Design an enzyme around this catalytic site. Structure first.
Site, mmCIF file in Angstrom:
data_model
loop_
_atom_site.group_PDB
_atom_site.id
_atom_site.type_symbol
_atom_site.label_atom_id
_atom_site.label_comp_id
_atom_site.label_asym_id
_atom_site.label_seq_id
_atom_site.Cartn_x
_atom_site.Cartn_y
_atom_site.Cartn_z
ATOM 1 N N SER A 1 24.815 14.052 -15.799
ATOM 2 C CA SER A 1 23.998 13.487 -16.865
ATOM 3 C C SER A 1 24.667 12.327 -17.596
ATOM 4 C CB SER A 1 23.581 14.574 -17.876
ATOM 5 O OG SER A 1 22.642 15.478 -17.287
ATOM 6 N N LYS B 1 22.714 9.134 -17.407
ATOM 7 C CA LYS B 1 21.648 8.768 -18.293
ATOM 8 C C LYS B 1 21.933 7.452 -19.036
ATOM 9 C CE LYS B 1 19.256 13.222 -18.806
ATOM 10 N NZ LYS B 1 19.987 13.984 -17.852
ATOM 11 N N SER C 1 19.806 16.094 -22.872
ATOM 12 C CA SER C 1 19.976 15.847 -21.425
ATOM 13 C C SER C 1 18.768 16.291 -20.593
ATOM 14 C CB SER C 1 21.231 16.538 -20.902
ATOM 15 O OG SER C 1 22.380 16.002 -21.505
#
Ligand SMILES: [Cl-]
Ligand SMILES: [Cl-]
Ligand SMILES: [Cl-]
Ligand SMILES: [Cl-]
Ligand SMILES: [Mg+2]
Ligand SMILES: [Mg+2]
Ligand SMILES: [Mg+2]
Lengths: 238, 239
Positions: free
Chosen positions: B48, B51, B96
């Site tokens: 994540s 991102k 997330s």
């Protein structure tokens, strides 16, 4: 219905032998709350809360290039230790560094400062007095509801670039944790103290503007403390 | 020297019976520090932490209009409760929310994703697998030092996307702020390792950091922040 008075908050001011107003605006509900409807619309000197529009103007006119540009200490030893050093826009806002912002104001100059405040619909739009001190001791006046200007800033609706508005919102950053973000600015004119800004939550934003009678700087911490007590009372923050 | 190894920090990992690396970069001094130079350069799935570049790309292409645009829950009940609701960019990065970013990635598409990771110099620039899961189970790999390099570009608005996109993503990375410091960062977990990457802003300096650690179970995820903070505290970066 749009505005609702809650006098229970007065206790938070009188608890400290003080008097003032807190104005809250719930953005999702489009509903305002205050302990004092009259005082919410009374106009005071903005003092260092003027650093918010002053920053926007300096950025948009290119007086300040970005948030990293260094304004070197002028070598005058002043009474506030954190003023006696180099600053950028971020730290100058953080420490309320009046001499840095006076230099911005002189560069901006009277004609442009006046035009921009007119374009901002900012308070009484009146810059009478010295170009580099009118927000501390000249003719400009703004009320708490008029400070709730902040909604335009939040939405990038002011008549300056979006970039200028994002940089100033960054510089306003005051606190953040997993629960909330506060973007805000304090001010003090030796008689009243201000705290204006907003609280970002996961699903909403609460705008606030507070001012209070402030005879001495010994009690400046009450600006944030009283405001937060109201926010906790209203279950806005934990 | 430019890089220094500080193996005393291994204490912070072993005291939690795990293994990992912290990398720090002192921007004022242009000097880097780590407990493990080799693991500092070992490239892993970003999970994540992807991102951050995903957001940048989605914004620059107009897949995401701004940080307030709402992405509706698709109605599929997933294992993470906070995922089962509407999100914007801010909340999606905070929690997330993988499925929201999977939708971003599908709209970006593989050609544009690949091109922008190359433009970003990001990790091994490899998007093999599904365009909407490659950072979780595909070919992309990035090391802790590569994270630092990427983050320094972002900090300075030097990535090949608009300044606006970069400012919005730095906003979304906001994790913590008090009178002493600001942390902008992003966690990641790929089932085998956990990450925390970002930086700490001070009055007169910025310290970039990238850490990862072995993560055999989800129970120890809070150690990513705890360990990194103990190091920052040891180095008198934060109190
Ligand atoms: Cl920010
Ligand atoms: Cl002040
Ligand atoms: Cl240093
Ligand atoms: Cl984050
Ligand atoms: Mg000084
Ligand atoms: Mg005059
Ligand atoms: Mg939402």
């Amino acid at each position: 219905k749009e505005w609702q008075e809650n006098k229970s908050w007065n206790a938070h001011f009188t608890e400290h032998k003080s008097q003032g107003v807190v104005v809250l605006w719930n953005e999702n509900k489009q509903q305002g709350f205050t302990n004092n409807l009259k005082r919410a619309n009374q106009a005071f000197l903005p003092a260092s809360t003027f650093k918010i529009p002053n920053s926007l103007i300096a950025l948009d006119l290119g007086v300040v290039k970005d948030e990293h540009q260094v304004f070197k200490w002028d070598g005058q030893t002043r009474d506030i230790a954190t003023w006696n050093r180099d600053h950028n826009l971020i730290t100058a806002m953080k420490y309320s560094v009046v001499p840095v912002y006076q230099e911005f104001a002189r560069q901006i100059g009277e004609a442009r400062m006046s035009k921009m405040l007119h374009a901002f619909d900012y308070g009484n739009e009146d810059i009478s007095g010295n170009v580099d001190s009118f927000w501390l001791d000249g003719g400009i006046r703004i009320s708490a509801t008029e400070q709730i200007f902040l909604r335009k800033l939040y939405h990038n609706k002011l008549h300056v670039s979006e970039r200028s508005q994002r940089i100033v919102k960054q510089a306003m950053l005051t606190e953040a944790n997993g629960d909330y973000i506060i973007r805000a600015k304090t001010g003090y004119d030796t008689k009243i103290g201000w705290w204006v800004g907003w609280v970002e939550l996961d699903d909403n934003v609460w705008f606030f503007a507070m001012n209070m009678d402030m005879p001495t700087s010994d009690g400046l911490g009450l600006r944030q403390a009283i405001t937060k007590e109201v926010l906790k009372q209203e279950k806005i923050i934990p």
